[PDB]
Backbone:
């Protein structure tokens, strides 16, 4: 034994292509649609909970994940790859930032760290690239609200609104029509639900949709009182009921 | 064929070709004979020269006062394995004040060879060895193959044309096993056995190598004028 | 070793260093040169534990010479002094620290200014008009504090130095066998051969 | 591809057999052992006339009592020479004596099968190791990249070797003087070399008990070449 | 294809062909068996006499682990020795930490996990042996058999090597004809017979029988070789049944 | 074993070329064009973003132009993720040098270090090379204003004007035509945008598809200022130079 | 075609070695099923002892991972025991470090992460097994969490695995569509086991003796397997109604 | 605190003649005021016509002699059964002793 | 660690990775060295596909290893930096331990040793570089010129050339260089060196670089003008 694969498994082909990255992007293309929209006073990220069997309890499978109290993530592609990246992203937010500066990282720098991990799986010995694209929404004091996409290559870009996976080309055109720089968070949620309905075949309700926001501080979710400067997490996952209430107003 | 690129690959019939190829190197080697009585054990080896200007390559290596071997195949591999045996004989003496049993030496060689047959990057040893010794249970002869198989025998031969010597010893078995207390007669039977594997050339004074170990006889090697007596 | 002094005048830096080497009971040598040229316009004098002094100085010299060849360029005295400080600051938390104190006298050809840096074995760096290590400062600084002017000539610097050495030879218990004096200016490094 | 330590179906190591092919492309080297000394000679084979041929170093001292000539990929020999010199000097440090010529040869040969996936390939050079010790007198060994070494009364390696070896088979006898051995090396080198043998494109050396290892001057070799020419013209 | 050129590669039908090729080496070996009796286990193996020059009784094949476990195998003999060396280390480390000698089921998994580990990577080759082993612990007698895949189960009787089919059928008769069980002494006799019967598939050469046993009543729960009179008596009983 | 799956990323072809370096250069030729021009009174860096969307947040976006320190910046052509690995390494080398010598790192010494790192991936380790070419724009008090480029081979060279990425052949010809030694920064700004305007594969050159930067001693008295242009400032210089 | 031998992407973004590991998962030709009661979690699996020389008491694919967690495996036994040993080590280590029993869902996630690594790192092969973890969790109650060679896992109201998983799955779905609750509304685990066996009989269309089944039961603070005689008593009650 | 050294007493004497040499030693072994043995040999025949005694701390002395005898064995293996000369034995023993320069063999050796 | 044997023998006894390294050298710009009676000159070709190049800062082709020794090369530029760094480090290490600067031959033997090591170490490829190393031994006035190549063999030369079209300029040197009378001045030596490059270069413009090395660490690079006067005078004697 020992891992004797100390050479790259991703290499340039004569045409300049990195095959394994292209193929990872193809795996993302097959994935269930997910999207994000940025409002003036918030960000929304959303995806479909495509349950594998009806005996499966799909609330136990979380596609939208808290990374820090003010940062959340969703994906399209290979679920297991996403799950391990979420574990690493949560950890790196602490080890390479919070344990140094005593505060959570700003969205763009946590994105930078995740991106670096994904880049290294594209060059290091004996590994394949991650088969996911991420959408990461967050807030921080000096940059305000933001939304980023990260791809298998490690490249990342900031968006006003975007979509990834299966129905992304159609969803992006739908979003270009409806997006403006004066949207309030409720408007962006409404648009997210409208956009997401197009790519969904079957049931479309609170139990089949997973939706989270980055918005106002939630002092009710802090777990303690008495420190004025601590006002609670900006990340919040909407309930099944909260989604259904907004589906009558649709 | 598609399964002989390395030692870590079984063929579809369950064979290990790199090991079989290592075995083939022994077959190209010069003949060497081993046999024993109840009091002594003898090695005889036909040495090979490169040409008329060259020396005859030594075949017999002493491992301890009570143990040694002869080789056929890759000589540098015999040097590695005999060095290992010297160390193990030595460890047994220093730590336990105990002469290493010939049977235990065989087990250790088997296990050392085996590891080179089951891992990537390695290669099997390309040499065969005949190990003689005298220990607490008397005279012994061992045959080692680089597959790791080690076998205890009254007599045997390895190398090119070893089959002739081996048949001779199979007929003589009942005679040579009884040659107790007469070193010279046991060596004669050894020189006669190895003669059944010669063609074109015969046994000369720089050709022949003999070693003996026994009851009151440290492992000693005879070359040159000391083998004229038996020519 | 024992006394090392430095003074920065108008247009040059002067380093004075004792000649004695003492192995306990005997003065083994009386002509020892306690200095290394790091580059054509930078000189380093040194004192501290036996062996470590010369080992450290030659190590620094080799490194600066390597830099000079790699870049075809002479580092400024400030840059050399920062490199030396870092090496001593790293050394003080080592398994066995270099027990070596240095003065670095250099002429900066870009600014056209002499510069004198004092660095102890801990990596404590300071830029000065004049400096010393060990007990040398205790005997000489009161004289330097009185007579020093920033516009002194080289000859006036040497005369003030003579006075410092005379006070050392009077009040110091150890015989340091005089000093070797070297001048660093725009034309490089030279040794005053009678002092 | 296939392992670097792979056996062929005949029971030979591919890489070792292939390095032997590189050695056949090397310039010729010859050694002759006598009771008065061992001679070592080489073909220099400069690739251009602007190459200063006394910078070609294919005969090399290992110790005062041991010399060495090479043939093949001669850059590969440098670490082998370095090891041999270290081993000779180390043995003298540990034992206050000269190391035996055979023991030195065995030590160099232990390096040879240390390749795998240690160095990445066998050496592409063969060595003639010549010397003297008190126990076995004047000796000449041939060290191969297989890790095998043979002792020889006389031996040739490199591109002209089997033509040279046939010659040595006929000319060697147990009563050769040192002078006779020198002329013999010169004569056989002259035979198998492409260019015309002279003092600038061939080089001689010997090891005697008294004076140790010596590389011959070009002036000294020039005289022996002249002397050879006259004895051949005399029948 | 090319799926069978490298260990640990799944073929499109979910198989590891290198392991299946290891089984071929096992099937090519001499016959070895084990019989679980009332208070113990018996092991026996066929040793082919390749020549007159083999010293009789001298190339012993059955191996002891600790003092209460016997191991026998068919296939590549060196691979079996490597596996037993590891088993001896596992037994020693178990007894060192926990004091008690390693229980047989615990020992079975140690060998199983090690053999299975050699199916996880392409940098190693699977074991070319099937191993029959067991003995007596605090819960009674245990017999196991372990394959190149790492697969093992407990057995009433077991057989491997070239004469495995013949031995199995013989073993099945004993299970049917003795639901109450077999005595250790009966099991030795039966083991001798079954090896003699299985030697038909190997008739070219003569062979030498080798037997061992661990029994609570007969050996005090220690592994011993069957020698001398008791061996001869089992050889005789076997010769009778093939005549 | 594992050898079977090894591409051997660090071998010569029979013509004495490095396969992976050549193929990385092919990758880089599809990246957005980046241009550097050196004047007597400063340096210009101009680069084209790859085909943008209306929903991309431009004012918070960086893909071409990066700050290494206060005196040195780079323009990137190739894999952005690969570039950020090397950029962070270069930022660290610059700080190491500043800590050691108490002087800002000379431009070439930084460039040589990054280029040596790239070289290493072509000779040992069996890993793929970085799919990145850099243009380095910087100032030091030895050579003044300097332009360099490096590529996946780890080779670097100095320039008065240079391009990397897509259409460098066309771009280089245009620069060579209009470049003059006595040219000033405001003239260089115009040349850079005119060249991108002509070589672009887009229909027209607009502010939202550009990144732009200048390094000027237009910082008051003997000191250097880096200016990474905002989207509105790129929009103004497009109008002022008469491209929109 | 070396993208078929190791865990790298094919041109369609697929991992063939993972797909082939799923195929190895059915090599034993065994079906298993798990359901939840009010207070318990039951798992049953077919038992086949095709050789008379085998000791049937040693033939099992149900594992006691910890006091509270049981595991049934669908796949070959060597890989099954590899996973079982690792799961036992992880559960014990978890309790040592964090001072409480490892939850069923957390162990499932951990084993799923390990599996994910084998799909991304080339030198390691996936294990050819599907792992169904069961317990009565102290926070979540009766729990079923299942892991596969892709590194995927999820919780279940009920589940089935093996060659005939679809028949069992649809049978279970039909029952829960009717009852409209996430579990078997039964007090005793004996009756939950009887339900589980009954619906496996219906779905496979085959009858069982006591030696044809393997049963594992999780209750508050322990997981245990039933003997042949406890199973016989189950079978008798099924037949008598 | 553990003291890794001890003192087993003993006295040895080596004299060189014109064509002979002797090495003598008493056979008493002691600790403090007690006798451990009245006959515990302390001068050894090491092969190749060499005799050796390592006097002082007996554990270190036995270890050194044991190592030197082993060195003679390996000198024969490595150098074609060549006889180890007394001058070569002495140099070899220097390297055995200096190898433990910072945790010495607490003995006075004579050959 | 990555261990793969990249340099291995072929059935005909060739090491192809080393031989392909020489092909990289063939492609590199031409380099030439000529020793006079009391000097050595190193001339280098500059490929003129690069205008808009800033020649102040662009890496120069001749490199000082110490104050008395220089190194030039043909082949992969990036590879050459690694050998130049190692050689410079070794030159300072030699001064530090021996208290004498390296001989030209010692420095050559070191660089050549590094090149050989990279032909039989696992996980590395050979240097695609050949070098010319020239200078004067400390306190010696006899000129020195050596050549190394990817295999690690090295030797001394009265005059030598490497890189593209070096077959042609070697042709020229072999007919124009007399050993019994080397270029007796700096002028004669520089003129013979520029002449040799003019066989191959194109414009005698900024295509040709010349560096002169004299005894006692006297090293200087000629400028465009001074070379231009050599180019000029050479062609005016031509039309005859």
Residues:
């Amino acid at each position: 034994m020992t891992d004797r694969y100390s050479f790259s498994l991703t290499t340039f082909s004569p045409s300049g292509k990195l095959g394994q990255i292209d193929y990872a992007l193809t795996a993302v293309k097959q994935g269930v649609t997910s999207l994000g929209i940025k409002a003036t006073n918030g960000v929304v990220i959303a995806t479909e909970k495509k349950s594998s069997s009806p005996l499966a309890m799909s609330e136990t499978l979380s596609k939208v994940s808290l990374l820090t109290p003010d940062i959340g993530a969703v994906y399209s592609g290979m679920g297991p790859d996403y799950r391990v990246l979420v574990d690493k992203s949560r950890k790196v937010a602490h080890t390479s930032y919070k344990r140094i500066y005593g505060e959570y990282p700003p969205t763009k720098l946590l994105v930078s760290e995740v991106a670096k991990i994904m880049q290294e799986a594209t060059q290091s010995g004996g590994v394949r690239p991650f088969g996911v694209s991420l959408l990461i929404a967050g807030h921080d004091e000096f940059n305000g609200f933001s939304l980023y996409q990260v791809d298998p290559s490690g490249s990342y870009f900031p968006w006003k609104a975007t979509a990834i996976g299966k129905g992304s080309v159609a969803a992006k055109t739908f979003l270009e029509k409806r997006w403006n720089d004066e949207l309030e968070l409720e408007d962006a949620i409404h648009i997210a639900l409208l956009t997401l309905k197009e790519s969904v075949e079957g049931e479309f309700n609170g139990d089949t949709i997973e939706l989270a926001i980055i918005g106002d501080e939630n002092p009710d979710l802090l777990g303690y009182t008495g420190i004025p400067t601590d006002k609670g997490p900006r990340f919040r996952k909407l309930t099944s009921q909260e989604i259904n209430d907004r589906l009558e107003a649709l | 064929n598609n399964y002989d690129g390395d030692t870590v690959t079984f063929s579809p019939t369950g064979r290990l070709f790199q090991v079989e190829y290592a075995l083939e190197a022994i077959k190209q080697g010069s003949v060497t004979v081993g046999l024993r009585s109840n009091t002594h054990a003898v090695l005889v080896a036909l040495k090979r020269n490169a040409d008329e200007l060259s020396s005859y390559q030594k075949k017999i290596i002493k491992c301890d006062e009570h143990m040694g071997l002869s080789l056929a195949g890759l000589a540098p591999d015999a040097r590695v394995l005999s060095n290992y045996l010297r160390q193990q004989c030595n460890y047994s003496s220093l730590v336990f004040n105990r002469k290493l049993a010939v049977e235990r030496a065989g087990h250790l060689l088997c296990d050392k060879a085996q590891k080179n047959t089951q891992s990537y990057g390695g290669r099997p040893y390309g040499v065969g060895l005949l190990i003689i010794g005298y220990d607490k249970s008397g005279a012994h002869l061992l045959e080692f193959q680089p597959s790791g198989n080690v076998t205890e025998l009254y007599g045997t031969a390895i190398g090119a044309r070893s089959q002739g010597a081996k048949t001779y010893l199979e007929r003589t078995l009942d005679t040579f096993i009884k040659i107790d207390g007469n070193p010279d007669e046991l060596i004669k039977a050894g020189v006669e056995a190895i003669s059944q594997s010669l063609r074109d050339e015969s046994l000369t004074v720089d050709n022949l190598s003999i070693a003996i170990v026994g009851k009151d006889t440290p492992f000693t090697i005879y070359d040159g004028e000391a083998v004229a007596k038996y020519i | 070793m024992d006394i090392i002094l430095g003074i920065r005048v108008q247009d040059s830096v002067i380093l004075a260093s004792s000649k004695a080497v003492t192995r306990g009971i005997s003065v083994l040598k009386d002509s020892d040169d306690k200095t290394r040229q790091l580059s054509p316009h930078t000189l380093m004098s040194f004192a501290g534990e036996a062996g470590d002094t010369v080992q450290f100085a030659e190590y620094i010299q080799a490194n600066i010479q390597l830099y000079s060849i790699r870049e075809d360029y002479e580092l400024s005295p400030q840059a050399v002094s920062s490199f030396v400080r870092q090496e001593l600051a790293k050394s003080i938390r080592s398994r066995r620290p270099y027990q070596v104190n240095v003065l670095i006298g250099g002429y900066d050809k870009k600014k056209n200014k002499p510069e004198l840096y004092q660095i102890d074995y801990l990596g404590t760096k300071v830029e000065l008009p004049y400096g010393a290590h060990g007990y040398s400062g205790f005997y000489t600084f009161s004289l330097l504090d009185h007579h020093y002017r920033p516009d002194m000539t080289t000859e006036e610097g040497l005369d003030l130095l003579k006075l410092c050495v005379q006070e050392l030879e009077k009040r110091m218990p150890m015989d340091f066998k005089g000093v070797i004096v070297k001048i660093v200016d725009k034309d490089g490094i030279r040794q005053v051969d009678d002092f | 591809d296939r392992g670097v330590s792979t056996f062929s179906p005949e029971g030979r190591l591919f890489q070792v057999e292939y390095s032997l092919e590189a050695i056949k492309l090397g310039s010729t080297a010859i050694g002759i052992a006598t009771k008065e000394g061992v001679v070592l000679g080489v073909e220099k084979r400069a690739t251009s006339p602007l190459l200063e041929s006394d910078s070609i170093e294919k005969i090399v001292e290992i110790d005062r009592h041991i010399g060495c000539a090479m043939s093949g990929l001669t850059a590969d020999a440098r670490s082998m020479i370095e090891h041999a010199r270290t081993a000779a000097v180390t043995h003298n440090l540990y034992y206050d004596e000269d190391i035996n010529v055979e023991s030195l040869t065995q030590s160099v040969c232990d390096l040879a099968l240390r390749f795998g996936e240690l160095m990445s390939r066998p050496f592409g050079v063969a060595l003639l190791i010549a010397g003297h010790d008190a126990d076995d007198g004047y000796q000449l060994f041939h060290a191969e990249p297989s890790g095998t070494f043979y002792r020889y009364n006389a031996k040739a390696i490199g591109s002209g070797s089997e033509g040279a070896q046939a010659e040595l088979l006929n000319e060697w006898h147990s009563s050769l003087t040192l002078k006779e051995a020198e002329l013999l090396v010169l004569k056989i080198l002259k035979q198998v070399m492409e260019e015309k043998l002279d003092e600038n494109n061939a080089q001689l050396s010997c090891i005697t008990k008294q004076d140790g290892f010596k590389i011959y001057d070009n002036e000294k070799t020039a005289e022996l070449i002249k002397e050879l020419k006259e004895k051949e013209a005399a029948e | 294809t090319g799926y069978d050129l490298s260990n640990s590669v799944f073929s499109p039908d979910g198989r590891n062909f290198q392991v299946e090729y290891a089984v071929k080496a096992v099937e090519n070996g001499t016959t070895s068996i084990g019989i679980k009796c009332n208070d113990g286990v018996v092991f026996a193996v066929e040793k082919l006499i390749t020549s007159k020059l083999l010293v009789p009784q001298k190339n012993v094949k059955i191996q002891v682990v600790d003092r209460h476990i016997g191991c026998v195998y068919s296939g590549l003999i060196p691979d079996g020795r490597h596996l037993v060396n590891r088993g001896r280390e596992e037994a020693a480390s178990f007894k060192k930490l926990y004091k008690t000698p390693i229980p047989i089921p615990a020992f079975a998994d140690r060998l199983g996990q090690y053999v299975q580990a050699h199916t996880l990577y392409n940098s190693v080759r699977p074991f070319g042996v099937s191993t029959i082993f067991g003995g007596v612990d605090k819960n009674g007698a245990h017999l196991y058999m372990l394959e190149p895949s790492g697969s093992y189960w407990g057995y009433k009787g077991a057989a491997t090597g070239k004469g495995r089919q013949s031995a199995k059928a013989e073993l099945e008769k004993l299970v049917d004809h003795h639901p109450e069980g077999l005595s250790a002494r009966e099991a030795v006799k039966q083991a001798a017979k079954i090896i003699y019967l299985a030697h038909e598939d190997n008739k070219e050469k003569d062979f030498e029988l080798e037997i061992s046993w661990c029994s609570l009543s007969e050996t005090n729960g220690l592994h011993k070789f069957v020698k001398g009179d008791l061996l001869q008596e089992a050889i005789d009983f076997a010769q009778k049944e093939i005549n | 074993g594992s050898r079977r799956y090894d591409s051997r990323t660090t071998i010569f072809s029979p013509e004495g070329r490095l396969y992976q370096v050549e193929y990385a250069l092919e990758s880089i030729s599809h990246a957005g064009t980046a241009i550097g021009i050196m004047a007597s009174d400063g340096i210009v860096l101009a680069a084209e973003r790859k085909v943008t969307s209306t929903l991309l947040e431009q004012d918070t976006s960086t893909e071409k132009l990066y700050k290494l320190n206060d005196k040195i910046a780079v323009a990137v052509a190739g894999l952005t993720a690969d570039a950020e690995i090397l950029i962070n390494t270069a930022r660290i080398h610059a700080q190491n040098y500043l800590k050691t010598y108490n002087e800002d790192i000379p431009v070439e010494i930084l460039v040589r270090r990054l280029s040596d790192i790239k070289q290493g991936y072509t000779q040992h380790g069996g890993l793929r090379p970085f799919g990145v070419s850099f243009i380095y724009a910087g100032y030091d008090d030895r050579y003044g204003y300097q332009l360099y480029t490096s590529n996946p081979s780890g080779n670097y060279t100095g320039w008065k004007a240079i391009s990397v990425g897509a259409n460098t052949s066309a771009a280089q010809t245009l620069l060579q035509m209009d470049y003059k030694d006595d040219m000033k920064v405001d003239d260089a700004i115009e040349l850079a945008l005119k060249t991108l305007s002509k070589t672009t594969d887009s229909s027209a050159l607009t502010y939202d598809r550009l990144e732009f930067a200048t390094i000027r001693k237009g910082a008051n008295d003997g000191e250097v200022y880096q200016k990474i242009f905002k989207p509105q400032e790129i929009k103004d210089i497009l109008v002022k130079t008469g491209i929109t | 075609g070396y993208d078929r031998h190791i865990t790298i992407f094919s041109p369609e973004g697929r991992l063939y070695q993972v797909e082939y590991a799923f195929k190895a998962t059915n090599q034993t030709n065994i079906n298993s099923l798990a359901v939840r009661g009010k207070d318990c979690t039951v798992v049953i699996s077919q038992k086949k002892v095709p050789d008379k020389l085998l000791d049937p008491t040693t033939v099992s694919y149900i594992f006691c991972i910890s006091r509270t967690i049981g595991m049934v495996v669908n796949g070959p036994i060597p890989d099954a025991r590899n996973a079982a040993l690792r799961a036992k080590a992880e559960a014990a280590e978890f309790r040592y470090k964090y001072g409480y029993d490892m939850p069923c869902d957390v162990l499932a996630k951990r084993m799923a992460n390990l599996s994910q690594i084998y799909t991304q790192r080339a030198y390691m092969r996936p294990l050819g097994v599907i792992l169904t973890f069961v317990s009565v969790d102290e926070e979540l109650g009766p729990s079923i969490y299942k892991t596969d060679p892709a590194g995927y896992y999820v919780g279940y109201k009920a589940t089935a695995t093996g060659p005939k998983q679809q028949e069992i799955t649809t049978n279970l779905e039909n029952h829960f569509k009717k009852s409209k609750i996430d579990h078997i509304n039964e007090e005793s685990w004996e009756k939950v086991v009887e339900f589980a066996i009954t619906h496996m009989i219906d779905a496979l269309g085959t009858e069982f003796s006591k030696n044809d089944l393997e049963v594992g039961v999780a209750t508050k603070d322990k997981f245990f397997t039933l003997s042949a005689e406890n199973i016989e008593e189950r079978l008798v009650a099924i037949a008598e109604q | 605190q553990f003291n890794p050294y001890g003192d087993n007493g003993g006295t040895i004497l080596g004299i060189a003649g014109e064509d002979f040499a002797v090495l003598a030693g008493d056979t008493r072994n002691i600790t403090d005021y007690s006798i451990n043995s009245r006959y515990e040999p302390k001068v050894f025949d090491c092969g190749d016509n060499i005799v050796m005694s390592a006097n002082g701390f007996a554990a270190d002395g036995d270890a050194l002699v044991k190592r030197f005898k082993n060195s003679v064995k390996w000198y024969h293996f490595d150098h074609n059964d060549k006889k180890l000369s007394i001058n070569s034995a002495a140099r070899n023993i220097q390297h055995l002793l200096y190898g433990k320069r910072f945790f010495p063999y607490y003995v006075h050796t004579i050959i | 660690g990555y261990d793969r044997a990249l340099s291995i023998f072929s059935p005909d006894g060739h090491i192809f990775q080393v031989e392909y390294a020489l092909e990289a050298v063939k492609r590199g710009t031409c380099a030439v060295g000529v020793k006079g009676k009391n000097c050595v000159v190193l001339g280098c070709e500059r490929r003129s596909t690069l205008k808009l190049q800033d020649t102040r800062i662009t890496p120069s082709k001749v490199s000082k290893i110490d104050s008395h020794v220089v190194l030039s090369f043909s082949g992969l530029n990036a590879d050459s930096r690694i050998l130049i760094e190692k050689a410079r480090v070794e030159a300072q290490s030699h001064r530090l331990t021996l208290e004498d600067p390296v001989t030209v031959e010692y420095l050559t033997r070191y660089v050549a040793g590094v090149q050989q090591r990279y032909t039989q170490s696992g996980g590395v490829r050979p240097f695609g570089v050949s070098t010319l190393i020239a200078g004067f031994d400390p306190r010696d006035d006899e000129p020195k010129l050596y050549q190394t190549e990817p295999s690690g063999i090295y030797s001394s030369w009265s005059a030598q050339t490497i890189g593209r079209n070096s077959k042609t300029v070697r042709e020229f040197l072999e007919k124009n260089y007399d050993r019994k009378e080397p270029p007796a001045t700096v002028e004669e030596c520089v003129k013979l060196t520029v002449r040799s490059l003019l066989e191959v270069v194109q414009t005698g413009a900024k295509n040709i670089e010349i560096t002169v090395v004299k005894p006692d660490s006297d090293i200087v690079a000629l400028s465009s003008e001074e070379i231009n006067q050599y180019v000029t005078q050479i062609e005016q004697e031509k039309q005859e």
In short: Residues 80-101 of chain F form the longest helix (22 residues). The CA atoms of residues 44 and 214 of chain F lie 5 Å apart.
